[PDB]
Amino acid sequence: DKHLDTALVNAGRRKKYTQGSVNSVIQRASSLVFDTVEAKKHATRNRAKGELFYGRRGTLTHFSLQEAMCELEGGAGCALFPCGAAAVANTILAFVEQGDHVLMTNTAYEPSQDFCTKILAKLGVTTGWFDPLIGADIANLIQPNTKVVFLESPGSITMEVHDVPAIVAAVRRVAPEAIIMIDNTWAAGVLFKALDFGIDISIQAATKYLIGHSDGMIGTAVANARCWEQLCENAYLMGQMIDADTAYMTSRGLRTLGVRLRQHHESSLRVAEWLAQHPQVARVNHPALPGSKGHEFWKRDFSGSSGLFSFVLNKRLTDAELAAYLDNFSLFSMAYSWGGFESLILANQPEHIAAIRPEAEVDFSGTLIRLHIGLENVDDLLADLAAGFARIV
Amino acid sequence: DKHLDTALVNAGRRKKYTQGSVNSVIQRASSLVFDTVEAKKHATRNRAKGELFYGRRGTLTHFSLQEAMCELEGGAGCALFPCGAAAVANTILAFVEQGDHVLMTNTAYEPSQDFCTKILAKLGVTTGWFDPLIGADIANLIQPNTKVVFLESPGSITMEVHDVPAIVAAVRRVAPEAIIMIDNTWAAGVLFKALDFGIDISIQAATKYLIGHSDGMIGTAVANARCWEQLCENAYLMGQMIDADTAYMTSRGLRTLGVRLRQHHESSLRVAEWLAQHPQVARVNHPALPGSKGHEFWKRDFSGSSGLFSFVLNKRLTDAELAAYLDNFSLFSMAYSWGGFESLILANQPEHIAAIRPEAEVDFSGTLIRLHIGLENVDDLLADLAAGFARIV
Amino acid sequence: DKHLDTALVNAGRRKKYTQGSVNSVIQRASSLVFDTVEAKKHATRNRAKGELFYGRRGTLTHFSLQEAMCELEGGAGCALFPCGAAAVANTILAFVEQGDHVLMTNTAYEPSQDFCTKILAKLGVTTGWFDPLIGADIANLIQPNTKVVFLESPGSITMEVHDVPAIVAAVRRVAPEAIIMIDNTWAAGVLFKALDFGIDISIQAATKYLIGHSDGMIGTAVANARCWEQLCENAYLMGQMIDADTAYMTSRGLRTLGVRLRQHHESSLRVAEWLAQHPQVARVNHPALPGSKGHEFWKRDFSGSSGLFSFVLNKRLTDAELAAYLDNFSLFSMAYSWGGFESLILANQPEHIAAIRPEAEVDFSGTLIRLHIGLENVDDLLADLAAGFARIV
Amino acid sequence: DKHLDTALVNAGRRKKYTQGSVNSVIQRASSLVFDTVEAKKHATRNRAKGELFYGRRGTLTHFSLQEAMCELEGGAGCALFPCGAAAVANTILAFVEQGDHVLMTNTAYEPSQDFCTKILAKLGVTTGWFDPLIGADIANLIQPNTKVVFLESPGSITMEVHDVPAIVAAVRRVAPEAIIMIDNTWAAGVLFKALDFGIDISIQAATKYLIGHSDGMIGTAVANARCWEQLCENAYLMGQMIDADTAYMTSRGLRTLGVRLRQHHESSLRVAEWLAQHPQVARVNHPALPGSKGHEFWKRDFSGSSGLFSFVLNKRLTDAELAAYLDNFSLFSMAYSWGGFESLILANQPEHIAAIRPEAEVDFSGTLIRLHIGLENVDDLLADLAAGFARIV
């Protein structure tokens, strides 16, 4: 959108929430006071509709964020969660019952898989898997009991991009009433407009790019009108909420999301292009890089890139080589999470990736390195990476 | 304990968390940085044991609170949640599988009931009910599939106190492996030492007295050694956590919990004694008041009282009488939640209470008024209540 | 007042600030938005009168605290500062110019003295000193150019209590238009109602008991109608303000100030009475203890005590004894500040105190110990002190 | 510098402050605990050198920000203040005494001027004024008692850029030991490396671009080695500090300062170039625009631009036209401050500016419009300005 940046600056900022400041007020509250019985009745009737009722439903600060998220992702409502993993687990749980079946991409975030295999399984809900590029063939995996189809594009760690139009079309042909979900964290909800593709719910670890500074955790799930009420009421029955201050900080992160993502795109594509020419690199998994799995879909369906990608080295590094490589970076830091201002580096052994690719086998044998490209000078990052290569040459 | 106040002041405050200040540092984080591969391996091995690993597991701020809660309630570990309702729902969920049965007091908090009837039911887990005074007779309700027995003493709104020794003994005679849980919010975890009575897990809406100021929401669940790992790992698979700042504010609330509770006890018992003599009052439900349901158990099993209690008026007030009464209080405010510094008032119609007392019928027909007695001058509160009575005489 | 606890719970909490919650909202702002030119003009006219104008003047959060402090201390306005030392320095500075003279108690807080001797002096403002028990004889020290009379009752460290009625009556006889100020931190502004005694400005380190938890730092100055505009505008010209969050935490602290102070009073008076009987104690300096300097004025003029006081040992400790004593306490900690939930201990040799008693000597030769008595169980604190005495006997 | 973005991401982030997280911990404290007498002595000796001593000196959070600011601005120390106006007032005050003279640019921020004329003057410190383009001719205004030369480049509102090399060389010829200060807020301390030009102290309203989101208020002053101790100790005697949380939020703001400033530069230069072509615009005052006063010094001496500038309309608006223009913008808002993510607009008549140009007249007669260009899509901002022009044509 030629207006995305204006939208990011303004989303959620209504006078009833800001009360004269630029940002929403921070309203910290469990108790919300009813001046009269009539006010209490009105609040009770509208307790899920943005009238102050009880802190577990939200205060003005949450309502402001919810409105911002619905504007930006084009949904009827936005559920809030203590983190991304809580958003995934509780959004799925909100729509499954015993005897149901979940069809999930085998490139899904590992905690999302483990929720399915270790929590859903014991509650009489089964989970099947599909390859991220299955396209229309996903119709062959839809079972009569399949209630949820769970997408994640690009995939975790390995970055494969779905053909969402093909998947959604097939799904709607066989099971039109299915709930289609996507973990849209990589796109920060704004580089891939999931609800415009017929997906029902767009889930985010707002922890990542929305917070944008590695110092807050929160999950969001923006649902279309069809699914909102079931998502909202079942998530609430599980007590799912976020504190008002983190909600404020997520709204605040939105304001710089455009300038941040443009830099992450520029810098990470430059690094990926360099890696793709490098003699010590076997493969580069960057959706914006020509040749990456699902790249043509990224070009067609996304409006940009973020800064997280991965590449495969020429060999499965030993523990000793991993230390010489990873321990001595000057700018990249080893840590989980991503989407912040700093660059991060992590290693995944191929066998370990195989272990979180259910009913599939990986097609590489070198150590996989996942990079988050932050806001540092890109030439300094390249020098850091080159020093890393020299330590394992 | 003659040392409870010293314990409250000091619990959780170790140098590794406070780093020279009186209170723990606030460490806001998703990304936790591993300086070396060996540090990452050590953190991974100990990722549930208080080594910094990932923000979803906690930072130093969470670890400090967890240690404080385990010291005060005598547990092996403490799981953290976005609110009390999340603690209840996810602690139960952590121990049930399809085909299991939950036995819950029919005086349980309404959201706890609704979690059971609207979430568990659809996942192949059934829920039966028991009267809060069932004592040893609870053995007759234990089914072969009963995995969880859920206590709440005193009960929500109506304040009936369990005979926990009798309940636990019966349960251990019939189903020793059962998971016995209690919602110990009213006692703030410290006026009733649940794990000392053979209960497995003590759950709190820390939102209430631990936060103590009506401006933060958080749930806790402190488990014995038998149950800790299952609670911890399954809650984590559901993404359950609290933000670091609210964890800091819960630790901070602990420091004044003793002085606060002593005032709430004194003031509320005085109000209850006055109400018990009042011609417009049919019943007073205060566990510390002679004559209240389960009072003798409160005297035997609790080390004090908090400030929440209820009473029954002589009549079922109409909507109009409810407004004349509730709208014109000067000091009491109408709001949900409790456990703060201010006094609160809410009305519950008898028919409404009947509706949240499954497989039971209430034994009163007047409107029930629930009072939270805060830190105001008690004589001013009495004058406010007297003015209320005059408006409906 | 028989309503002070009700006032503490309710002060500053108007709907325009709370907007539905129990506590005021936290409005973080520099920019405050004017919808129209007319709105901008109105805000400009009322920029010192609680209309949103610019964050340096305050937001809703500051206005709420300002109203609370004016209600509790009975003033026309309350200026806010980054800490207590800033409140003292800038409140004095607001009322002086080259050629003026300040008359200050020689028991004033050491940073207050240093502000006078190291900042004011080179700006052409002289400072004279008086003994805290001077009473009516202060009239003899008033010079033609005396502009400010600065009180601190009880005094720092040595705890001498002024005869404020005698001092004020004498000042008003000679210099009726003098600006009489007090550092009222020990009373937390509520145990001694300074403005009711004819003092013009009551200054506090809200850092201490108002915050109550040893984390936030903030200064306040509550002025009568005669002095408010000059205080407000001149402090504003020095850019003095506090952040919105600390202002929120100060308002929040007020709510438990009554229950906290009653415990600090009860426990510190007990400790003082015990020390007074102890053979290793030469003197106890506690305003509430009979025999302490100015005790009779404390009993007449205050409505209670806080928890800070000092005592003099029966000997001068050697450096080895100071370490053996101080290094090995179990519950008392060595730190500056006070007014929190935990107990603190510091030591000073007589000549250290003499060096901060301008134009005076000290009347003791033993080591002085300053104690802050927190919220721990008092018998535990007594055992800690007894163990310390045994280490130096 | 080709490393400025890497420096912004990493400045101040040492392990002793971050303790495992990406950002520094937030250590809220007044009291800082000494485990032993020897530890207390060590902290005392190093109380201005980054050892924990007392919260008025700072905690780990402040130390981290101080180190970041010294690295980025190339100074020996950084003093912290509650807002920019406090930093200006207290940094000047730290270096003057009765009989001294201050020489200030007549384009200085109005509160800075008012501090000089309304506070300093009655303390025996005189202030003289100079035109911002005076250059080497400032030598003729240096008096025997001139102690401080105060620069502000670009100037407030009218944006004139000094020739700092010429000014500094002239001052050093006549008064080599003068204290040369600059309010470097517009450059955010990084677009103009003041200390590299021989300026002694670089002051900022960190409120503006460092915070970057219009919420926090904070002042900073970075001094060279010659001036640091006097600045530090005299600001400390006035109690000047910032709260730990705002210090954290300032460090956090640094991380996105590069990506934000590049957008503000690009967008504001585009708007300025467009306004310069517009028939309703008489003049554009933007340091980066050719023809603007001192533009050539901006191009030589700065490494970029921020987003604040002004322009002069082709006529003097009537009051009716001012309302029609200002009241009806869709994206630009009327508010004070700047440096955030959103665009702002204010107006001043020529005589308003003349009244804050001491000893000078203004050289324009049209209404002056000050714009802050935020992060919105620039074509949307242009359309908003075009619609405004149509309302007054």
Ligand SMILES: *Cc1c(COP(=O)(O)O)cnc(C)c1O
């Ligand atoms: C990081 C991650 C999550 C987890 O969110 P948390 O806030 O860390 O619980 C979920 N989905 C994806 C794609 C992620 O990368």
Ligand SMILES: *Cc1c(COP(=O)(O)O)cnc(C)c1O
């Ligand atoms: C208030 C309440 C809860 C709910 O906790 P929230 O933090 O409000 O979700 C749970 N149990 C009891 C007994 C309660 O009163």
Ligand SMILES: *Cc1c(COP(=O)(O)O)cnc(C)c1O
């Ligand atoms: C604490 C103290 C101060 C200074 O307050 P800070 O907030 O630490 O700057 C002022 N007066 C008294 C009496 C104090 O004890």
Ligand SMILES: *Cc1c(COP(=O)(O)O)cnc(C)c1O
């Ligand atoms: C904003 C402003 C200041 C004052 O800063 P505050 O934080 O608002 O007190 C100082 N100098 C300049 C140039 C300013 O624009």
